């Protein structure tokens, strides 16, 4: 140990004017006892099968050397505090060194974890290690497909279950996609089945076929084993197309079931936005296509609504920097649909959905950067779209924050 | 010498007998799949197609002749192999 | 396996029509290759003929016969009936040899090797538009060969011209993420263009063609 430190300890105790040979005599005795215990605490670590050297190993190494694992206090009486340890002192270098006594009471206690259970699995089947989640894993000759017939039959069953004839079949097949470890080396055929499907499934706007494929994309993404960004380029158009394309079926009713599609689809696109990110390739490319979809003149009220939703969940800053200079255009579009007077076209439904979504985003965009003062008529400086109802949404958000 | 490419052999007169990172090149980061987005529509035998094992697996890039004079691998005449996996061939 | 006499005669007439006796028989032979329905069973012979003929450029640096073989490949691609997926591994390095080789000419100064460069670059952009699949990795391999031929110094101005020509015929995002970082290389080019001292060499015409 540094001899300077021992001098500091000695003069802070009442023992002043100690020599250097007296002080060097202290720091080779105590540095041996630290070396004697840490060599003796490594015996409990090697008999623990833990290779960790936990805090309790020094408590047993001290008790082995007939010294109390008493830390921070030493009882010359010994009777109340014998060789049982108190678990040390939870102290830090960067600590505050003063807390309020009701701060420790009001904090929630940590969760007691699960008790020890015994599960069995198979390290090896007659010599071969299985790929279960408990384990780490002149005529030219007639070639064989790189899939097995069990794997090819599995692909056929999973794809015929994922087209959603029965809901329990879908849900298992989706969980099977979500956690099969060996679903790599079948992933080109799944990506091609998705991509090809959406493109010949928007020729006739078959909403279920699309909602099932978007759920298949979402089940492909949260699988941790497979490597997806080799198929990420193929995936981006299929997830994006369902959200903003025109609907060849009925726009007015299954409108909501199409907005529910746009939701589970915004999920795969949001995964694409958050994952797979390198410099200026993926997020900025879909942001540029969404903005030129927005600045597009006489855009379809279906494509318009989908692109509006897509630019909406781009996170905190994206609506902070993009939706700002465009409120007047949104209001003018709403006014034209209102003028009509024909309500035969899906234009009125598209307008109502777009206005509601834009107003909710604008509400927190406001709740987030500014106090809730003058929530009555100051929003009339922003064409008076959401106004007091926007203020009420901000108040509900504030109530949720208070509950948190 | 007498097989396909005999004409070439006779003309010759030979008579025996960080920006290089893998991601940069993935086609999600190099393609305009934004056009693919369509706005307005207007097994005892393997079901999946079998692809050319040589194209799928072989390194056909060892045959790319980058420099005629300094060519790293000595190339050899190729014999016709008549793959029977391909249909439309009688044998 | 062996060609019947009918298609043996058809192979002989079609290959000898594209060697350069006259232009009209060549145009009718290329319009035969592009627009016949049954030319399978003669596709491996055509692929072997084309790849060996592009190889025979190293013994005789004939620009004209290479232009004829590249128009033979361009005619083979336009055929709707025959599928070149099984034979594209032979035609890719032949067009690549027509792009990134350095001596494409017999007289380097007057022969326009430059056009067999942009013609074969357009050809390889078409061959990796029609055939690149994620199992193939044709386009990513082709971009990687072009890129490590361009970024690497000591490469001649002809092969750098071929690399830039192919990379720029691939598309807009490729020239965004490959060409535009090395725009400072233009300064290294203009080192040898605006400023001498040697002027009568052959580097200047290739350098301002690259420019």
From Swiss-Prot, chain B:
Fill in the PTM field for this protein. Answer: Phosphorylated by casein kinase II in vitro.
Q: Where in the cell is it found?
A: Nucleus
What the record says about family reads: Belongs to the TAF1 family.
Q: Domain note for this entry?
A: The Bromo domain mediates interaction with histones that have acetylated lysine residues at specific positions. The second domain also recognizes and binds histones that are butyrylated and crotonylated.
Illness? Dystonia 3, torsion, X-linked: An X-linked dystonia-parkinsonism disorder. Dystonia is defined by the presence of sustained involuntary muscle contractions, often leading to abnormal postures. DYT3 is characterized by severe progressive torsion dystonia followed by parkinsonism. It has a well-defined pathology of extensive neuronal loss and mosaic gliosis in the striatum (caudate nucleus and putamen) which appears to resemble that in Huntington disease.
According to its UniProt entry, the function of this protein is described as: The TFIID basal transcription factor complex plays a major role in the initiation of RNA polymerase II (Pol II)-dependent transcription. TFIID recognizes and binds promoters with or without a TATA box via its subunit TBP, a TATA-box-binding protein, and promotes assembly of the pre-initiation complex (PIC). The TFIID complex consists of TBP and TBP-associated factors (TAFs), including TAF1, TAF2, TAF3, TAF4, TAF5, TAF6, TAF7, TAF8, TAF9, TAF10, TAF11, TAF12 and TAF13. TAF1 is the largest component and core scaffold of the TFIID complex, involved in nucleating complex assembly.
Q: How does it assemble?
A: Component of the TFIID basal transcription factor complex, composed of TATA-box-binding protein TBP, and a number of TBP-associated factors (TAFs), including TAF1, TAF2, TAF3, TAF4, TAF5, TAF6, TAF7, TAF8, TAF9, TAF10, TAF11, TAF12 and TAF13. Interacts with TAF7; the interaction is direct. TAF1, when part of the TFIID complex, interacts with C-terminus of TP53.
Q: What is this protein called?
A: Transcription initiation factor TFIID subunit 1
Q: What is the species of this protein?
A: Homo sapiens (Human)
Q: In terms of the whole protein, what range is present?
A: 363 to 532 of 1893
From Swiss-Prot, chain C:
Care to name a GO molecular-function term for this sequence? DNA binding
Q: Where would you say this protein principally sits, based on its record?
A: nucleus
Q: Which family is this sequence assigned to?
A: Belongs to the TAF6 family.
What Gene Ontology terms describe where this protein resides (cellular component)?
cytosol; MLL1 complex; nucleoplasm; nucleus; protein-containing complex; SAGA complex; SLIK (SAGA-like) complex; transcription factor TFIID complex
Which disease does the record tie it to? Alazami-Yuan syndrome: An autosomal recessive syndrome reminiscent of Cornelia de Lange syndrome and characterized by delayed psychomotor development with intellectual disability, hypotonia, microcephaly, short stature, poor speech, and dysmorphic features.
Q: What's the protein called, per UniProt?
A: Transcription initiation factor TFIID subunit 6
Record's subunit section: Component of the TFIID basal transcription factor complex, composed of TATA-box-binding protein TBP, and a number of TBP-associated factors (TAFs), including TAF1, TAF2, TAF3, TAF4, TAF5, TAF6, TAF7, TAF8, TAF9, TAF10, TAF11, TAF12 and TAF13. Interacts directly with TBP, TAF1/TAFII250, TAF9/TAFII31 and TAF12/TAFII20. The TAF6/TAFII70-TAF9/TAFII31 heterodimer forms an octamer complex with the TAF4B/TFII105-TAF12/TFIID20 heterodimer.
Record PTM Phosphotyrosine, positions in chain: 40
> In its UniProt record, which GO terms are filed under biological process?
apoptotic process; DNA-templated transcription initiation; mRNA transcription by RNA polymerase II; negative regulation of cell cycle; negative regulation of cell population proliferation; positive regulation of apoptotic process; positive regulation of DNA-templated transcription; positive regulation of intrinsic apoptotic signaling pathway
User: Which positions carry Phosphoserine?
Assistant: 51
Where is the protein found, in the record's own terms?
Nucleus
- Tell me the residues on which Phosphothreonine occurs: 35
What the protein does? The TFIID basal transcription factor complex plays a major role in the initiation of RNA polymerase II (Pol II)-dependent transcription. TFIID recognizes and binds promoters with or without a TATA box via its subunit TBP, a TATA-box-binding protein, and promotes assembly of the pre-initiation complex (PIC). The TFIID complex consists of TBP and TBP-associated factors (TAFs), including TAF1, TAF2, TAF3, TAF4, TAF5, TAF6, TAF7, TAF8, TAF9, TAF10, TAF11, TAF12 and TAF13. The TFIID complex structure can be divided into 3 modules TFIID-A, TFIID-B, and TFIID-C.
* Record keywords: Apoptosis, Disease variant, Intellectual disability, Isopeptide bond, Methylation, Nucleus, Phosphoprotein, Transcription, Transcription regulation, Ubl conjugation
Q: Does the keyword Transcription regulation apply?
A: yes
């Amino acid at each position: 140990l540094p001899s300077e430190s021992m001098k500091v300890v000695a003069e802070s105790m009442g023992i002043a004017q100690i020599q250097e040979e007296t002080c060097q005599l202290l720091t080779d005795e105590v540095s041996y006892r630290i070396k004697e215990i840490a060599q003796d605490a490594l015996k409990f670590m090697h008999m623990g099968k833990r290779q960790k050297l936990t805090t309790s190993d020094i408590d047993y190494a001290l008790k082995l050397k007939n010294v109390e694992p008493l830390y921070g206090f030493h009882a010359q009486e010994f009777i109340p505090f014998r060789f049982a340890s108190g678990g040390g002192r939870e102290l830090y270098f960067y600590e505050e060194k003063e807390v309020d006594l009701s701060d420790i009471i009001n904090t929630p206690l940590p969760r007691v974890p699960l008790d020890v259970c015994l599960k069995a699995h198979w390290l090896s089947i007659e010599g071969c290690q299985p790929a279960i989640p408990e384990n780490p894993p002149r005529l030219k000759p007639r070639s064989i497909h790189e899939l097995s017939v069990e794997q090819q039959l599995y692909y056929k069953e999973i794809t015929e279950a994922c087209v959603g004839s029965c809901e329990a079949k879908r849900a298992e097949a989706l969980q099977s996609i979500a956690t099969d470890p060996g679903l790599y080396q079948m992933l080109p055929r799944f990506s091609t089945f998705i991509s090809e499907g959406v493109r010949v499934n928007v020729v006739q706007n078959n909403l279920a076929l699309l909602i099932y494929l978007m759920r298949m994309v979402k089940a492909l993404m949260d699988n941790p084993t497979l490597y997806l960004e080799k198929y990420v380029h193929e995936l981006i158009p299929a997830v994006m197309t369902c959200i903003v394309s025109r609907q060849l079926c009925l726009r007015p009713d299954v409108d909501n079931h199409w907005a529910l599609r746009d939701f589970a689809a915004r999920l795969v696109a949001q995964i694409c936005k958050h994952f797979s990110t390198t410099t200026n390739n993926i997020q900025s490319r879909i942001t540029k296509t969404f903005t030129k979809s927005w600045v597009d003149e006489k855009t379809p009220w279906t494509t318009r609504y989908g692109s509006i939703a897509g630019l909406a969940e781009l996170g905190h800053d994206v609506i902070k920097t993009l939706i700002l200079p465009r409120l007047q255009q949104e209001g003018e579009r709403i006014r034209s649909v209102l003028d009509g007077p024909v309500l035969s076209n899906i234009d009125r439904i598209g307008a109502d959905h777009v206005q509601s979504l834009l107003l909710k985003h604008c509400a927190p965009v406001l709740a987030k950067l500014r106090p809730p003062p003058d929530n009555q008529d100051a929003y009339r400086a922003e064409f008076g779209s959401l106004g007091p109802l926007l203020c009420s949404q901000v108040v509900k958000a504030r109530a949720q924050a208070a509950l948190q | 010498r007498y097989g396909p490419a005999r004409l070439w052999y006779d003309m010759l007169g030979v008579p025996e007998d960080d920006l290089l990172a893998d991601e940069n090149f993935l086609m999600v980061t190099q393609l305009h799949w934004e056009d693919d987005i369509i706005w307005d529509g207007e097994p005892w035998y393997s079901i999946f197609p079998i692809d050319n094992e040589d194209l799928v697996y072989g390194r056909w890039e060892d045959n790319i002749i980058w420099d005629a004079q300094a060519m790293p691998r000595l190339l050899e005449p190729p014999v016709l192999t008549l793959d029977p996996n391909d249909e439309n061939l009688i044998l």
